[PDB]
Write a protein that binds this DNA or RNA. Sequence first.
DNA 1: GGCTACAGGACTC
DNA 2: CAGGAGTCCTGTAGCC
Length: 341
Amino acid sequence: MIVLFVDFDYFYAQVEEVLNPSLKGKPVVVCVFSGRFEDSGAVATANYEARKFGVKAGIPIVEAKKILPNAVYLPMRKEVYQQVSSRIMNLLREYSEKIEIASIDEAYLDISDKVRDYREAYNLGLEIKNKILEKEKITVTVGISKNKVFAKIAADMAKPNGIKVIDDEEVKRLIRELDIADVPGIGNITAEKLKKLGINKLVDTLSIEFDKLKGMIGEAKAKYLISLARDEYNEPIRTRVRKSIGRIVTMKRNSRNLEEIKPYLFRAIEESYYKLDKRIPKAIHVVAVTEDLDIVSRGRTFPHGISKETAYSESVKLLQKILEEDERKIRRIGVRFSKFI
DNA sequence: GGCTACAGGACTC
DNA sequence: CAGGAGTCCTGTAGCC
Ligand SMILES: Nc1ccn([C@H]2C[C@H](O)[C@@H](COP(=O)(O)OP(=O)(O)OP(=O)(O)O)O2)c(=O)n1
Ligand SMILES: [Ca+2]
Ligand SMILES: [Ca+2]
Ligand SMILES: [Ca+2]
C-alpha cells in the first residue's frame, strides 16, 4: 500500500493571510475569545513568524501578548477556514477515490493504484502541492509511506511547506531510532508511562512482556504499538462520517446555580441543532468543564430521535444530575448529540 | 465470558 | 492562565 498524507501548514493563520495579504511576513495569532474579560481565551494557532518566539496553539491569549505585544491578533472565523478546507478536499478527491478526511486540514489518500513505486508517488505529491498552491494559494506538507502512521510521521519531519518519503528501509530504521513519543496516539501521559519501562523506541516494545505493556497502556494502544514495531500496521483508508455534533460555551462567571447556567445551556442546544443540520440524534450528553478544568458529563440514549423540545427538557435533568453528583463549580457548559438515525 | 450503556480519560486538531 | 471540538478506548455493571 502507498499512502499519501496531506497536512495544511499554519492553516487558520495562513487562510487569514490569503484573505489579507497585508498580514504577509508579520506574526499572526488566531484567537478564541471566551468573553470573560478583555483578552480572556486561548490561541487556536499562529504562523511561523509568531511560533519561533513561543506563541503556539493552546496557550493563553494573555501569555501570547506579553511575548508578542505588537503581534496581530485575530478572532477565529471557523466557517471561513471550513469553507476553504472543503474546496481543497474536493480537489484532493480528483487524485483518488480512496480518501480519508481526518480533520479540518488533513487528508489521507490511497494511491496504491495510481503510482508504481515511490518516485512516481513523490511526483504525484509535487503535483498535488502545486495544484493547491495555484487554486487556493495554500502551502501544504505531504508525507508518503507504506501506512497512515508513517505517512503522518513523514509529514511533520518535513514541516513546513515540505514533502518527504519514508521508504520500507527508512521504516525499519525509524522503528529503531524514532522516539516513541513522536508516534501518533502517544501523548505525555502515555509517553511517561512508556519512558518508565525503558521504552523509548517502538522496537523495544517487542522485548517487553505483552501483559506488562497491556496492563500499563491498555490492550488497544499495546497492539497498536506492537503492530507498528513489527511493521505490520495496515489500517485501510476509510471514508469518515461525523459521529457527534456539539457546542460548549464558557460562562461569564463560574457557578452551581441552575437558573444562572440554564441560559448558556439553552444557547448551546440552539446552536447545536442548527449544526445538526438535518441529522437526527438519538443520544444527548450534557458536558461541563469544571472550576479546575476537569470534564464531567452525563448523557442518555432514546429509542427514537430527540426533538429540540425533548433536548431542552432532557438537558436540564442531565445538568441536574451533574450538579448533585459533583460538588465543583461549572465554568463551561454545553451539549453533544450522537447516534444519528 | 463477552456484549451494551454509560462516564472517565487520553489525544489531536 | 487555562477555547472549542471531535474520536476512540476502558472499567463497571446488567444481562444472556
Ligand atoms: N489546539 C488546536 C489545535 C488545532 N487547531 C486548529 C487550527 C489549526 O490551524 C488547525 C491545524 O492544526 P495543526 O496542529 O496542524 O497546526 P497548524 O496547521 O496551524 O500548524 P502546522 O504548520 O504545525 O500544521 O487546527 C486549533 O484550533 N486548536
Ligand atoms: Ca496534523
Ligand atoms: Ca496543519
Ligand atoms: Ca507526541
